[PDB]
Scaffold this active site. Structure first.
Site, PDB file in Angstrom:
ATOM      1  N   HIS A   3      -7.410 -17.124  13.552  1.00 50.73           N
ATOM      2  CA  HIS A   3      -7.185 -17.746  13.335  1.00 50.73           C
ATOM      3  C   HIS A   3      -8.074 -19.076  14.686  1.00 50.73           C
ATOM      4  N   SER A  51     -11.934 -18.695   8.806  1.00 50.10           N
ATOM      5  CA  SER A  51     -12.890 -18.073   8.416  1.00 50.10           C
ATOM      6  C   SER A  51     -13.723 -18.087   7.790  1.00 50.10           C
ATOM      7  N   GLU A  83      -7.541  12.858  -2.059  1.00 55.03           N
ATOM      8  CA  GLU A  83      -7.267  11.640  -3.332  1.00 55.03           C
ATOM      9  C   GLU A  83      -8.756  10.948  -3.415  1.00 55.03           C
ATOM     10  N   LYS A 105      -5.212 -20.705  -6.111  1.00 57.33           N
ATOM     11  CA  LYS A 105      -6.536 -20.142  -6.227  1.00 57.33           C
ATOM     12  C   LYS A 105      -6.472 -18.557  -6.883  1.00 57.33           C
ATOM     13  N   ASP A 106      -5.432 -17.804  -5.547  1.00 56.74           N
ATOM     14  CA  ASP A 106      -4.757 -16.568  -5.086  1.00 56.74           C
ATOM     15  C   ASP A 106      -4.095 -16.545  -6.660  1.00 56.74           C
TER      16      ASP A 106
HETATM   17  C1  HEM Z   1      -3.514  -4.354   5.340  1.00 52.72           C
HETATM   18  C2  HEM Z   1      -4.933  -4.156   5.164  1.00 52.72           C
HETATM   19  C3  HEM Z   1      -5.082  -6.260   5.262  1.00 52.72           C
HETATM   20  C4  HEM Z   1      -5.071  -7.496   5.187  1.00 52.72           C
HETATM   21  C5  HEM Z   1      -3.294  -7.720   5.019  1.00 52.72           C
HETATM   22  C6  HEM Z   1      -5.959  -8.385   5.569  1.00 52.72           C
HETATM   23  C7  HEM Z   1      -5.662  -9.759   5.064  1.00 52.72           C
HETATM   24  C8  HEM Z   1      -6.379 -10.703   4.869  1.00 52.72           C
HETATM   25  C9  HEM Z   1      -6.265 -11.404   4.530  1.00 52.72           C
HETATM   26  C10 HEM Z   1      -4.735 -12.284   4.519  1.00 52.72           C
HETATM   27  C11 HEM Z   1      -7.651 -11.832   5.526  1.00 52.72           C
HETATM   28  C12 HEM Z   1      -7.843 -13.935   6.034  1.00 52.72           C
HETATM   29  C13 HEM Z   1      -8.352 -14.066   3.936  1.00 52.72           C
HETATM   30  C14 HEM Z   1      -9.128 -13.239   3.979  1.00 52.72           C
HETATM   31  O1  HEM Z   1     -10.319 -13.972   4.682  1.00 52.72           O
HETATM   32  O2  HEM Z   1      -9.529 -12.697   2.546  1.00 52.72           O
HETATM   33  C15 HEM Z   1      -8.264 -10.806   6.179  1.00 52.72           C
HETATM   34  C16 HEM Z   1      -9.655 -11.345   6.860  1.00 52.72           C
HETATM   35  C17 HEM Z   1      -9.819 -10.459   7.040  1.00 52.72           C
HETATM   36  N1  HEM Z   1     -10.001  -9.278   7.738  1.00 52.72           N
HETATM   37 FE1  HEM Z   1      -8.552  -8.489   7.012  1.00 52.72          FE
HETATM   38  N2  HEM Z   1      -7.128  -7.418   6.204  1.00 52.72           N
HETATM   39  C18 HEM Z   1      -7.102  -6.124   6.726  1.00 52.72           C
HETATM   40  C19 HEM Z   1      -7.823  -5.013   6.255  1.00 52.72           C
HETATM   41  C20 HEM Z   1      -8.690  -5.555   7.267  1.00 52.72           C
HETATM   42  C21 HEM Z   1      -9.774  -4.872   7.033  1.00 52.72           C
HETATM   43  C22 HEM Z   1      -9.311  -3.327   7.536  1.00 52.72           C
HETATM   44  C23 HEM Z   1     -10.539  -5.231   8.180  1.00 52.72           C
HETATM   45  C24 HEM Z   1     -11.590  -4.920   8.135  1.00 52.72           C
HETATM   46  C25 HEM Z   1     -12.038  -3.857   8.510  1.00 52.72           C
HETATM   47  C26 HEM Z   1     -10.587  -6.401   7.677  1.00 52.72           C
HETATM   48  C27 HEM Z   1     -10.873  -7.874   8.667  1.00 52.72           C
HETATM   49  C28 HEM Z   1     -10.738  -8.945   7.804  1.00 52.72           C
HETATM   50  C29 HEM Z   1     -11.951  -9.715   8.289  1.00 52.72           C
HETATM   51  C30 HEM Z   1     -13.198  -9.529   9.466  1.00 52.72           C
HETATM   52  C31 HEM Z   1     -11.536 -11.232   8.087  1.00 52.72           C
HETATM   53  C32 HEM Z   1     -11.801 -12.405   8.849  1.00 52.72           C
HETATM   54  C33 HEM Z   1     -13.340 -13.323   6.915  1.00 52.72           C
HETATM   55  C34 HEM Z   1     -13.482 -14.061   6.952  1.00 52.72           C
HETATM   56  O3  HEM Z   1     -12.961 -15.068   6.750  1.00 52.72           O
HETATM   57  O4  HEM Z   1     -15.133 -14.342   7.630  1.00 52.72           O
HETATM   58  N3  HEM Z   1      -9.151  -6.597   6.955  1.00 52.72           N
HETATM   59  N4  HEM Z   1      -7.720 -10.256   6.022  1.00 52.72           N
HETATM   60  C1  HEM Z   2       1.311   1.229   3.413  1.00 51.14           C
HETATM   61  C2  HEM Z   2       1.835   1.491   2.626  1.00 51.14           C
HETATM   62  C3  HEM Z   2       1.778   2.583   1.880  1.00 51.14           C
HETATM   63  C4  HEM Z   2       1.036   3.192   1.220  1.00 51.14           C
HETATM   64  C5  HEM Z   2      -0.152   3.270   1.356  1.00 51.14           C
HETATM   65  C6  HEM Z   2       1.929   4.648   0.919  1.00 51.14           C
HETATM   66  C7  HEM Z   2       1.494   5.534   0.013  1.00 51.14           C
HETATM   67  C8  HEM Z   2       2.158   6.818  -0.338  1.00 51.14           C
HETATM   68  C9  HEM Z   2       1.076   7.512  -0.738  1.00 51.14           C
HETATM   69  C10 HEM Z   2       0.318   8.305  -1.297  1.00 51.14           C
HETATM   70  C11 HEM Z   2       2.410   8.408  -1.879  1.00 51.14           C
HETATM   71  C12 HEM Z   2       1.862  10.261  -2.972  1.00 51.14           C
HETATM   72  C13 HEM Z   2       2.392   9.743  -3.820  1.00 51.14           C
HETATM   73  C14 HEM Z   2       2.792  10.102  -5.110  1.00 51.14           C
HETATM   74  O1  HEM Z   2       1.712  10.877  -5.750  1.00 51.14           O
HETATM   75  O2  HEM Z   2       3.840  10.323  -5.891  1.00 51.14           O
HETATM   76  C15 HEM Z   2       3.391   8.115  -1.664  1.00 51.14           C
HETATM   77  C16 HEM Z   2       4.643   8.597  -1.609  1.00 51.14           C
HETATM   78  C17 HEM Z   2       5.553   8.186  -0.968  1.00 51.14           C
HETATM   79  N1  HEM Z   2       5.970   6.901  -0.601  1.00 51.14           N
HETATM   80 FE1  HEM Z   2       4.670   5.472   0.482  1.00 51.14          FE
HETATM   81  N2  HEM Z   2       3.044   4.458   0.846  1.00 51.14           N
HETATM   82  C18 HEM Z   2       3.426   3.240   1.371  1.00 51.14           C
HETATM   83  C19 HEM Z   2       4.755   3.156   1.970  1.00 51.14           C
HETATM   84  C20 HEM Z   2       5.925   3.049   1.966  1.00 51.14           C
HETATM   85  C21 HEM Z   2       7.378   3.290   2.658  1.00 51.14           C
HETATM   86  C22 HEM Z   2       7.391   2.377   3.328  1.00 51.14           C
HETATM   87  C23 HEM Z   2       7.947   3.961   1.983  1.00 51.14           C
HETATM   88  C24 HEM Z   2       9.547   3.881   3.277  1.00 51.14           C
HETATM   89  C25 HEM Z   2      10.017   4.954   3.316  1.00 51.14           C
HETATM   90  C26 HEM Z   2       7.309   4.793   1.648  1.00 51.14           C
HETATM   91  C27 HEM Z   2       8.186   5.286   1.593  1.00 51.14           C
HETATM   92  C28 HEM Z   2       7.593   6.631   0.297  1.00 51.14           C
HETATM   93  C29 HEM Z   2       8.049   8.037  -0.321  1.00 51.14           C
HETATM   94  C30 HEM Z   2       9.451   8.242  -0.054  1.00 51.14           C
HETATM   95  C31 HEM Z   2       7.455   8.666  -0.965  1.00 51.14           C
HETATM   96  C32 HEM Z   2       7.796   9.932  -1.765  1.00 51.14           C
HETATM   97  C33 HEM Z   2       8.023   9.735  -2.940  1.00 51.14           C
HETATM   98  C34 HEM Z   2       6.550  10.076  -4.361  1.00 51.14           C
HETATM   99  O3  HEM Z   2       5.806  10.786  -4.209  1.00 51.14           O
HETATM  100  O4  HEM Z   2       6.823   8.558  -4.758  1.00 51.14           O
HETATM  101  N3  HEM Z   2       6.470   4.018   1.672  1.00 51.14           N
HETATM  102  N4  HEM Z   2       3.683   6.902  -0.271  1.00 51.14           N
HETATM  103  C1  LIG Z   3       0.632 -15.476   7.361  1.00 52.26           C
HETATM  104  C2  LIG Z   3       1.531 -15.141   7.350  1.00 52.26           C
HETATM  105  C3  LIG Z   3       2.683 -15.865   7.590  1.00 52.26           C
HETATM  106  C4  LIG Z   3       3.127 -16.248   8.903  1.00 52.26           C
HETATM  107  C5  LIG Z   3       2.404 -16.932   9.918  1.00 52.26           C
HETATM  108  C6  LIG Z   3       2.284 -15.812  11.138  1.00 52.26           C
HETATM  109  C7  LIG Z   3       3.447 -15.913  11.832  1.00 52.26           C
HETATM  110  C8  LIG Z   3       2.728 -15.954  13.045  1.00 52.26           C
HETATM  111  C9  LIG Z   3       2.210 -17.318  13.876  1.00 52.26           C
HETATM  112  C10 LIG Z   3       2.526 -17.066  14.713  1.00 52.26           C
HETATM  113  C11 LIG Z   3       1.418 -17.079  16.010  1.00 52.26           C
HETATM  114  C12 LIG Z   3       0.768 -18.068  17.243  1.00 52.26           C
HETATM  115  O1  LIG Z   3      -0.117 -19.213  16.154  1.00 52.26           O
HETATM  116  C13 LIG Z   3      -0.772 -20.077  16.443  1.00 52.26           C
HETATM  117  O2  LIG Z   3       0.717 -21.291  16.259  1.00 52.26           O
HETATM  118  C14 LIG Z   3      -0.082 -22.252  16.453  1.00 52.26           C
HETATM  119  C15 LIG Z   3       1.041 -23.322  15.756  1.00 52.26           C
HETATM  120  O3  LIG Z   3       1.894 -22.936  15.017  1.00 52.26           O
HETATM  121  C16 LIG Z   3      -1.247 -23.199  15.302  1.00 52.26           C
HETATM  122  O4  LIG Z   3      -1.147 -23.949  16.508  1.00 52.26           O
HETATM  123  C17 LIG Z   3      -2.115 -25.262  15.204  1.00 52.26           C
HETATM  124  O5  LIG Z   3      -1.897 -26.099  15.153  1.00 52.26           O
HETATM  125  C18 LIG Z   3      -0.737 -26.762  15.320  1.00 52.26           C
HETATM  126  C19 LIG Z   3       0.149 -27.563  14.745  1.00 52.26           C
HETATM  127  O6  LIG Z   3       0.133 -27.209  12.619  1.00 52.26           O
HETATM  128  C20 LIG Z   3      -1.743 -27.528  16.354  1.00 52.26           C
HETATM  129  O7  LIG Z   3      -0.668 -27.800  17.557  1.00 52.26           O
HETATM  130  C21 LIG Z   3      -2.880 -26.287  16.867  1.00 52.26           C
HETATM  131  O8  LIG Z   3      -3.801 -28.531  17.585  1.00 52.26           O
HETATM  132  C22 LIG Z   3      -3.221 -25.644  16.295  1.00 52.26           C
HETATM  133  O9  LIG Z   3      -4.317 -25.079  17.281  1.00 52.26           O
HETATM  134  C23 LIG Z   3      -2.502 -21.809  16.264  1.00 52.26           C
HETATM  135  O10 LIG Z   3      -3.527 -21.842  15.475  1.00 52.26           O
HETATM  136  C24 LIG Z   3      -1.795 -20.738  15.964  1.00 52.26           C
HETATM  137  O11 LIG Z   3      -2.976 -19.260  16.104  1.00 52.26           O
END
Ligand code: HEM
Ligand code: HEM
Ligand SMILES: CCCCCCCCCCCCO[C@@H]1O[C@H](CO)[C@@H](O[C@H]2O[C@H](CO)[C@@H](O)[C@H](O)[C@H]2O)[C@H](O)[C@H]1O
Ligand SMILES: CCCCCCCCCCCCCCCCCC(=O)OC[C@H](COP(=O)([O-])OCC(O)COP(=O)([O-])OC[C@@H](COC(=O)CCCCCCCCCCCCCCCCC)OC(=O)CCCCCCCCCCCCCCCCC)OC(=O)CCCCCCCCCCCCCCCCC
Ligand SMILES: CCCCCCCCCCCCCCCCCC(=O)OC[C@H](COP(=O)([O-])OCC[N+](C)(C)C)OC(=O)CCCCCCCCCCCCCCCCC
Ligand SMILES: CCCCCCCCCCCCCCCCCC(=O)OC[C@H](COP(=O)([O-])OCC[N+](C)(C)C)OC(=O)CCCCCCCCCCCCCCCCC
Ligand SMILES: CCCCCCCCCCCCCCCCCCCC(=O)O[C@H](COC(=O)CCCCCCCCCCCCCC)COP(=O)(O)OCCN
Ligand SMILES: CCCCCCCCCCCCCCCCCCCC(=O)O[C@H](COC(=O)CCCCCCCCCCCCCC)COP(=O)(O)OCCN
Ligand code: HEC
Lengths: 124, 383, 244, 71, 85, 56, 54
Positions: free
Chosen positions: B202, B206, B272, B228-229
């Protein structure tokens, strides 16, 4: 890499007749395929600016150059989001692709690099 | 002043999802971030639900999964949703990482969100590995065995660590119960790091597909990127639907429907699909410790992209040679994936080694060279 | 690996349930249960299926209670704590032929016949593999194949030598619905039944999938309209620049 | 009788005749080779699994749909 | 490197007039057919080589490798397999 | 015109309507996992003798 | 159109009420419609189709 680096190396190539004979035509084709001119950019508009040095160089641009750069960035952003290309006068002609920023960044960097050198001077 | 700005809690939400200033030209590859958040939410909901019906004890685990399939109302759906979303999570994360590498999202000033990102990727791998073991089918047991034995390569203490991780002399009940507890925990850790990488981002905002500043031209996150999302949310849900309802087992291994048997070894023990490229890299090195180092290095080497990319320009939109190199890199990563699941036979052995060399030479040789040359071409070409 | 080590890959047969909108044929399911009961159940268990599971799929409540009531199950101990048996109930699971693995292997020259509850999911090929295997015992093994003792040649089975002999022959079962019980017919029915046993939610799953596909598609269409509508002021933006 | 018996025979004599011949030739060779003495102390014993697979794969392609149509 | 609304960190802007119309005043799908055909063709044509070249090369490599592997495990490939191991 | 606005609200409204119906279906099907599973519902009957039971 | 807008759309309370009532109707009618369609394309195959024999 620093702009200084890129400029110095380029000058070594442009000096060597052989090297320039083979590199200059390639560079011109590269630029044609790059296609930044088709969004109305000048080459220098693409340089990464999120650096202390580049922020200082941009602040030193003459106001006119600065206002025009802002417009080219906004215009290119609009082409980007619309999935269109520039047409007509929006296309950057090769003669318009001037290195307006290179002198400013080279001066900023000159000082920055001299400062690093002089920070390491040893009284003999 | 509007309440959304005045109140500190509301203002934090506001700053991320509403007033957040975005570039006006993000393309559809910027939609994977929200898809990853969606996968994480689906996994939390389905995962916590499965935990209400699953038993972690080795005598009951496989059967508790059958009970979920057969007796629990919509248990089949919750199970298949959880299993398939794990695959979709990796498709989205590879797309997101692909976007980041193509568009130079790892460059200054975004080194920190990228580096935290690399850790998120490691946490997802561990989460998914442990979850797969929980079924306690044949692939579960044998997968755990071979992957946990890679730790034996650590010099001196290696074998001791393996017994410590197992809580015994082989993968058994202690291992299954600890994997349950850690599988439950890891997604929460992962969510924290996902939040951290956003907070780190932030500060710069982006990046965008042109690789220039967007400070000149910002759009509010809502309503533009909210709506758009939604398009990609519904496209995702269509893909989800086709797998979950019409082909729930397409991405799985039949052997995981056989209960774990320590005596019988399955014909082929493969990870996998999403782990397959790293497994191919491991096979490429003949040495045990060598192979493990290479496999880990294949992920940690992402941390050096900020250094080895020498370009004065962010991203590949305007770099024809870099675009070609990127294409070869991505296709090689897919070939490694394929080679991860072939038999260790000619001629795939040598092919795997060549592809492994290409993988590493991208970071160490090609990207530094190509980015240097393109710098010079931009300068000379525009004189 | 050699093709022999893999096993021959089964043909893709046109099952009634193939097809995004297709259920199982329940008359085939019922006939397949009869093949299980009269042929396979001698050696193979179906431990994950309870009598209640047949009800409203293949049998009425009464027919399934009748099946359960013919068997004896372990009851809770009596008042002196002595073991007792009771007649079966709908909640009971279909009982297997053997008390343990050791007894199973002893009866089958060392081979252990797997439980068939998940076999359609536990093998590449599913129904096609089951059908191909049951109908694919050649009269004579290909010249040059050496079978281990107690093994039978079947090309669909990896390695070629399977511990299970051919069991389906024309008219081993007399179907209650008058269908001619040929080897092929019985293999088709039992393969269908076993596929049902592995995935009993199949029919409901595909109907809910149809509903989901329709709703999600409509939502995708509307989301495209709404995005375009909201974005049009940005897309349609125009500039006039007069350099200062 | 089993509809498959006739369908398989028809497919072997018809669209899969080349494969049928190869299998037949193979069996002839292997049986003859087994007939010869000091076969048991040979390095390489040929089978006919490959040719059998080619034939069966062919028969199945030409029959699968026809068989299920008459059940 | 990014500020906030009112102080985003843009260099001073002057001389640009921007114009647009209401979403309710516009046809959202104006020129959709032309875009869907001609615009998509142009965009795809310009990127085609960057996809085709690496995909086709790696598919060729795989095809050759998988065909050899299949051949090595036939009877015909016995000798070449023996050497390879 | 009112007709012009009404059309776009019809699209928005339809989208809201399917999202509402889809959420309701999702919530109902998903939460039903917490209702008694099929095996729990199978337990239902017990026979007791009465000869053994004394008066009072 | 003015009338329709003024009654069902202008006030968001009315608009949300209309959307939810429509969702309720859609849910009930779509259920019935899919049920009938599913039964026609899978005719003679379902338990309900063979139940009468038993
Ligand atoms: C649970 C996994 C992740 C979530 C939920 C996540 C979510 C996001 C979101 C919502 C943004 C801003 C919107 C977007 O650009 O798509 C973002 C930006 C970014 N993420 Fe992730 N991300 C994840 C994993 C990763 C991983 C594995 C990497 C890198 C190895 C990564 C690197 C970045 C970078 C560099 C940005 C900034 C990109 C840009 O706007 O130019 N994230 N991520
Ligand atoms: C990033 C989040 C997660 C990923 C990527 C993930 C991935 C997986 C995968 C690959 C399996 C094997 C599925 C199958 O072939 O049956 C699995 C099983 C399971 N996961 Fe997760 N998991 C996630 C989060 C969680 C969370 C938060 C819970 C809370 C307990 C959970 C509970 C389980 C349980 C109980 C199973 C075994 C039952 C089954 O195979 O369906 N998982 N998970
Ligand atoms: C994406 C999931 C949604 C939940 C949000 C994530 C929760 C955690 C966010 C808090 C972390 C602190 O994040 C920080 O917050 C302040 C105010 O909120 C932001 O501050 C920004 O907005 C405020 C007004 O909107 C301005 O005063 C400031 O000039 C600007 O920088 C920072 O840019 C951000 O980095
Ligand atoms: C998984 C879960 C499901 C969710 C789906 C999300 C995927 C959406 C996405 O990110 O891709 C859509 C995306 C469209 O996104 P966009 O925002 O219009 O443009 C993004 C490109 O940068 C714009 O690229 P461009 O303008 O240069 O157009 C290039 C594109 C043409 O793209 C068009 O759609 C036109 O054509 C190709 O590259 C095809 C290659 C040729 C093969 C022959 O499709 C592509 O462009 C894919 C190209 C990748 C190669
Ligand atoms: C397969 C090989 C893909 C190579 C892509 C080359 C560029 C191209 O044509 O793409 C179209 C577009 C080109 O977009 P662009 O932004 O460069 O150009 C837009 C148009 N101009 C040039 C006028 C501004 O590229 C993308 O959108 C690339 C996103 C990369 C995502 C890759 C995911 C792979 C996952 C592996 C993880 C490790
Ligand atoms: C998922 C839950 C979906 C619930 C739908 C209930 C009605 C809300 C809706 O669709 O949005 C209409 C309303 C308003 O949409 P709107 O903002 O386009 O309408 C305002 C303008 N008038 C009232 C003149 C039409 O959305 C909300 O109030 C937010 C709820 C989101 C859902
Ligand atoms: C699945 C979820 C889809 C269902 C919710 C969509 C909204 C339903 C219709 C309601 C609607 O369109 O009205 C807007 C509400 O949208 C909103 O306020 C939200 C806009 C988009 C909904 C979700 C945003 C997704 C973005 C990130 C995805 C994250 C995935 C991770 C889990 C307000 O319209 P208006 O506010 O434009 O003004 C207009 C004047 N009031
Ligand atoms: C968690 C995974 C989320 C993905 C949703 C996919 C469908 C899951 C629901 C089950 C289903 O198949 O619903 C069908 C209808 O489809 C639908 O209408 C559902 C598709 C809608 C997709 C997006 C809508 C909301 C999803 C997430 C919101 C969650 C917040 C509230 C729970 C069947 O209908 P039925 O007969 O089974 O229905 C009962 C009332 N008639
Ligand atoms: C009297 C013995 C016997 C009868 C009858 C029998 N089987 Fe089997 N079956 C076995 C044995 C033993 C194995 C294990 C073979 C092996 O692993 O070598 C087996 C294995 C199988 C396999 C698994 C092969 C594999 O891929 O592992 C399936 C499927 C199967 N049987 C189904 C059936 C069906 C369907 C029927 C009858 C309609 C049937 N069996 C009748 C003894 C029998």
């Amino acid at each position: 890499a620093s702009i200084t680096s890129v400029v110095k190396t380029s000058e070594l190539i442009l000096k060597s007749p052989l090297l320039s004979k083979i590199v200059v035509p390639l560079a011109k084709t590269y630029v044609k395929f790059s296609g930044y001119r088709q969004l109305g950019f000048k080459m220098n508009d693409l340089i990464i600016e999120e650096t202390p040095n580049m922020q200082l160089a941009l602040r030193r641009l003459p106001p006119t150059e600065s206002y025009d750069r802002v417009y080219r960035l906004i215009r290119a952003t609009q082409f980007s989001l619309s999935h269109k290309l520039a047409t007509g006068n929006d296309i950057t002609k090769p003669e318009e692709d001037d290195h307006y920023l290179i002198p400013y960044i080279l001066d900023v960097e000159a000082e920055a690099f001299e400062k690093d050198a002089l920070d390491n001077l040893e009284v003999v | 002043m509007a309440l959304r700005k005045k109140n500190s809690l509301l203002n934090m939400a506001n700053s991320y999802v509403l007033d957040s200033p975005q570039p006006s030209n993000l393309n559809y590859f910027w939609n994977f971030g929200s898809l990853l958040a969606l996968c994480l939410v689906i996994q939390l909901a389905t995962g916590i639900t499965l935990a209400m019906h699953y038993t972690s004890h080795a005598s009951l685990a496989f059967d508790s999964v059958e009970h979920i399939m057969r007796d629990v109302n919509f248990g089949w759906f919750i199970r298949y949703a959880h299993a398939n979303t794990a695959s979709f999570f990796f498709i989205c994360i590879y797309a997101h990482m692909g976007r980041n590498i193509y568009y130079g999202s790892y460059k200054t000033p975004r080194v920190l969100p990228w580096s935290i990102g690399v850790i998120i990727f490691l946490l997802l791998i561990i989460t998914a590995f442990m979850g797969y073991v929980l079924v306690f089918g044949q692939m579960s047991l044998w997968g755990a065995t071979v992957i946990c034995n890679l730790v034996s390569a650590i010099p001196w203490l290696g074998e001791d660590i393996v017994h410590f991780l197992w809580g015994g002399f082989s993968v058994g009940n202690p291992t299954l119960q600890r994997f349950f507890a850690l599988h439950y925990l890891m997604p929460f850790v992962l969510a924290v790091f996902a939040l951290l990488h956003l907070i780190a981002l932030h500060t710069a905002g982006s990046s965008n597909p042109l690789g220039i500043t967007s400070n000149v031209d910002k759009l509010s996150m809502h309503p533009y990127y909210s709506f758009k999302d939604l398009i990609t949310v519904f496209a995702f849900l269509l893909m989800f639907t086709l797998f979950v309802f019409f082909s729930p087992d397409k991405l799985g291994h039949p052997d995981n429907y056989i209960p774990a048997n320590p005596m019988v070894t399955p014909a082929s023990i493969v990870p996998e699909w999403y782990l397959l490229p790293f497994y191919a890299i491991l096979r490429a090195i003949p040495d045990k410790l060598g192979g493990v180092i290479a496999m880990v290095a294949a992920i940690l080497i992402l941390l050096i992209l900020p250094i080895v990319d020498r370009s004065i320009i962010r991203g590949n939109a305007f770099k024809p040679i870099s675009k070609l190199l990127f294409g070869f890199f991505i296709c090689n990563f897919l070939l490694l994936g394929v080679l991860g699941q072939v038999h260790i036979e000619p001629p795939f052995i040598v092919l795997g080694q060549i592809c492994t060399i290409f993988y590493f030479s991208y970071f160490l040789i090609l990207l530094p060279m190509v980015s240097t040359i393109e710098n010079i071409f931009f300068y000379i070409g525009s004189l | 690996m050699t093709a022999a080590e893999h096993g021959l890959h089964p043909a893709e047969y046109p099952w009634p349930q193939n097809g995004m909108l297709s259920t199982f044929d329940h008359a085939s399911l019922r006939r397949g249960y009869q093949v299980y009961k009269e042929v396979c159940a001698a050696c193979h268990s179906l431990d994950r299926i309870a009598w209640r599971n047949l009800v409203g799929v293949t049998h009425t409540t009464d027919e399934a209670k009748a099946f359960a009531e013919e068997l004896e199950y372990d009851d809770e101990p009596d008042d002196e704590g002595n073991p007792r048996k009771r007649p079966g109930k709908l909640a009971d699971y279909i009982p297997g032929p053997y008390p343990n693995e050791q007894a199973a292997r002893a009866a089958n020259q060392g081979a252990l016949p797997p439980d068939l509850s998940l076999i359609a999911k536990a093998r590449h090929g599913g129904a096609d593999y089951i059908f191909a295997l049951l109908t694919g015992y050649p009269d004579e093994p290909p010249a040059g194949v050496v079978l281990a003792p107690g093994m039978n040649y079947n090309p669909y089975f990896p390695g070629g030598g399977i511990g299970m002999a051919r069991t389906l022959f024309d008219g081993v079962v007399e179907y209650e619905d008058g269908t001619p019980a040929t080897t092929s017919q019985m293999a088709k029915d039992v393969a269908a039944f076993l596929t049902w046993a592995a995935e009993p939610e199949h029919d409901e799953r595909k109907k809910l999938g149809l509903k989901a596909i329709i709703v999600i598609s409509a939502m995708l269409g509307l989301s495209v309209y709404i995005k375009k509508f909201k974005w049009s002021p940005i897309k349609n933006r125009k500039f006039i620049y007069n350099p200062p | 009788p089993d509809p498959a018996i006739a369908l398989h025979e028809a497919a072997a004599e018809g669209p899969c005749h080349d494969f049928k011949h190869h299998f037949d030739e193979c069996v002839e060779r292997v049986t003859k080779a087994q007939e010869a003495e000091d076969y048991d102390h040979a390095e390489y014993k040929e089978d006919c699994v490959e040719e059998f697979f080619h034939l069966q794969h062919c028969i199945n392609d030409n029959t699968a749909d026809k068989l299920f149509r008459v059940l | 490197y990014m500020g906030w609304w009112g102080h985003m960190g843009s260099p001073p802007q002057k001389g640009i007039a921007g114009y647009t119309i209401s979403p309710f005043a516009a046809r959202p799908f104006a020129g959709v057919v032309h875009a869907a055909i001609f615009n998509t063709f142009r965009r795809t044509k310009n990127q085609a080589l960057f996809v085709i070249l690496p995909v086709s090369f790696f598919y060729y490599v795989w095809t050759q490798a998988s065909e050899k592997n299949e051949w090595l495990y036939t009877k015909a490939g016995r000798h070449e397999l023996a050497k390879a191991l | 015109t009112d007709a012009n606005r009404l059309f776009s609200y019809f699209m928005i409204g339809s989208f809201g309507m399917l999202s509402a119906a889809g959420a309701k279906a999702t919530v109902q099907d998903f939460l039903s996992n917490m209702s008694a599973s099929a095996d729990v519902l199978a337990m239902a009957k017990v026979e007791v003798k009465l000869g053994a039971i004394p008066l009072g | 159109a003015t009338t329709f807008y003024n009654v069902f759309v202008k006030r968001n309370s009315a608009f949300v009420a209309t959307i939810l009532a429509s969702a309720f109707v859609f849910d009930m009618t779509f259920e019935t419609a899919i049920d009938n369609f599913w039964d026609r394309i899978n005719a003679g195959k379902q338990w309900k189709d063979i139940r009468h024999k038993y």
